[PDB]
Amino acid sequence: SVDNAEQIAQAYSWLRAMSGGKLTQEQVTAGDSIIAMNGLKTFAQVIGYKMSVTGFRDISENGYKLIKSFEGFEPKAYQDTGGVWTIGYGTIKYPNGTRVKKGDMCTMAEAEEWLKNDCAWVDACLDKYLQPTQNQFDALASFVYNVGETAFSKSTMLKSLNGNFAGAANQFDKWVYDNGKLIKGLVNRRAAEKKLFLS
Amino acid sequence: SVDNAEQIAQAYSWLRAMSGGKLTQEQVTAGDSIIAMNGLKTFAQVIGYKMSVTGFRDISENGYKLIKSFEGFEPKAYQDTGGVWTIGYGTIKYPNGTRVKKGDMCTMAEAEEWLKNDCAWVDACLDKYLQPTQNQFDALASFVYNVGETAFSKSTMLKSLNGNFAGAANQFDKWVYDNGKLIKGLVNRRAAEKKLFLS
């Protein structure tokens, strides 16, 4: 409703998961055009992003640790696989809505700030599809932020959540395929989310 | 590149799968605004829809039969769960880009025409992620049209495709959950795609 530049980075990282893990410069250029032209709400609405209050738990420092681990610190802006300029821990939009560009530089304490804004939709999403999971949804937050809202809502992994927590823990492992192929980073990532799923 | 009104219905049914099985009037109103404002290409680009030539096989009449079976014939326009006016076999945009509206009426031969346009992205999608599967991808086409491009590209079901065709056939069954819940229509649907997966 009330537009805020904070939410641009959020819609985009939500879109990034719905687009299978990456954005193309085509998407970003299209969506920035929409945002300039129609307003942030039209952008969020057409993709299905319902901007979010959830007094359930927040991503703890350790949750951010593994999230950080998989994104990979980049202290200078670099052109990603899709062609979008990117910096820090996967950040393409600063909290003030401006774009990462060629030349930008950061520190880890800067980059983790932008990452918290990047991720700030994950707990709201986790809330609507889930029992309070104390504070070991830090593995789930890393999971939904990687895999996306629609993916989580259709998952057999969600079935065993709401209460076989042991099959959920084994479900992390199955999500390692991309494009029919097995991805070492994913099982590596899946492993660390499965393992962190066990306090 | 060259815009065509045919492709509006296609981007939307592709978006419908990426949005977890339904569109809200919010999405449609947003996307029609974008299309009027920025052009069809900006709409397709921001959602990740790469409009498609694939001389591999086409959805046979029987493939359309089960697709028809699950959509459900509606000879008069009706407001869907999401609030979008809908007619025939799940059609919300006619091939000329105009919207289904309150008052519209059809026949089965009309509705199956619009359905073929609705689905005309499925075979291109099937081509890029897949071996020629003779003409028993009529179960896969019904699968991808329901479940969406990103879903198919991350599926363990795709892993066994490219060649354990027997685990694929059993994979259909697992996709029955939505929102953590089991859906009778889905296993019903999954069943008929699993079974049709065996000539």
Author numbering:
A (entry chain A), B (entry chain A): 2 to 53, 56 to 133, 136 to 167, 169 to 205
From the study:
To understand the catalytic mechanism and thermal stability of these peptidoglycan hydrolases, we attempted to decipher their structures and eventually obtained the crystal structures of PHAb8, PHAb10, and PHAb11 by X-ray crystallography. All these observations together indicated that PHAb8, PHAb10, and PHAb11 were highly evolutionarily related to T4 lysozyme and might share similar catalytic mechanisms of action.
We solved the crystal structures of PHAb8, PHAb10, and PHAb11 and unveiled that hyper-thermostable PHAb10 underwent a unique folding-refolding thermodynamic scheme mediated by a dimer-monomer transition, while thermosensitive PHAb8 formed a monomer. Results showed that PHAb8 was a monomer, while PHAb10 and PHAb11 formed an asymmetric dimer. Interestingly, PHAb8 showed high topological similarity to monomeric PHAb10 and PHAb11, with the typical catalytic triad (Glu-Asp-Thr) located at the coil region. In contrast, PHAb7, PHAb8, and PHAb9 completely lost their activity after treatment at 70°C for 1 hr. Our results showed that PHAb8, PHAb10, and PHAb11 were denatured with transition temperatures of 41.4°C, 53.7°C, and 59.9°C, respectively.
